[PDB]
Structure 1
Amino acid sequence: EYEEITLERGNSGLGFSIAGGTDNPHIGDDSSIFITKIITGGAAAQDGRLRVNDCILRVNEADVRDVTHSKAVEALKEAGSIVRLYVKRRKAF
């Protein structure tokens, strides 16, 4: 099951936060950064944005799995007006 979320841009804090660590905070093999928390009180929360805690599959139709910490923050922010995130979840066991 996959559900894409197309939210609008912000200005200085959409409302949701993200965590990452490819080569900025500490060395690592997995560049794919994950979400930490969705802070209510922003364009993101206003339109929606659920509580995430994992890495996104793609951003703005492009995979941002090739970034650093400061790049990921900008990869979204600099994504443009409307930002669309795709997330898929497979069922098993």
Structure 2
Amino acid sequence: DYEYEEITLERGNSGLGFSIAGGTDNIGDDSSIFITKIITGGAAAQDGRLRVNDCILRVNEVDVRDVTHSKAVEALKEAGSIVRLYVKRRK
């Protein structure tokens, strides 16, 4: 009852083009890192695959299933210009 997707984004001037919430130290009742917003015109919205409330499992090879919010934010800041996102959604 979960669907998985690997998604590769090209960092833009406004970053990857989405916002995240969650973490062990935090929205949504659990520790998961999840998308809350996809920015019109940004990287994630031009690639077309990421969805609001998608749950980020891995950023490149960094496992973000059990991290603080900042570690996740930093895992994304430091992921390079071509970024492999591994996600799952309730669909």
TM-score by length of 2: 0.70
Larger % of strand: which?
Answer: 2
Report deviation, 1:9: 1.5
Say which is worse superposed, 36-45 or 47-56, in terms of deviation.
47-56
Q: 1:9 aligns with which of 4, 8, 11?
A: 11
Provide the residue aligned with 1:75 in structure 2.
75
State the secondary structure of the residue aligned to 1:12.
coil
List per-residue Cα deviations over 1:29-81 (Å, max 9, x = no partner): 95332221212121222233432304222221331124222221121121111
Report deviation, 1:90: 8.5
TM-score by length of 1: 0.69
Unaligned 5+ residue runs, structure 1? none
When Rg is computed on C-alpha atoms for both structures, the one with the higher figure is 1
Q: CA RMSD in A?
A: 3.1
Counting aligned pairs with the same residue, the percent is: 99
Once residues 33 and 55 of structure 1 are traced to their aligned partners in structure 2, the CA distance between those partners, rounded to angstroms, is 6
User: How many pairs were matched up?
Assistant: 89
Q: In 2 relative to 1, CA 50–37 (structure 1 residues): closer, same or farther, beyond 3 Å?
A: same
Provide the residue aligned with 1:66 in structure 2.
66
Q: In 2 relative to 1, CA 67–42 (structure 1 residues): closer, same or farther, beyond 3 Å?
A: same
State the secondary structure of the residue aligned to 1:87.
strand
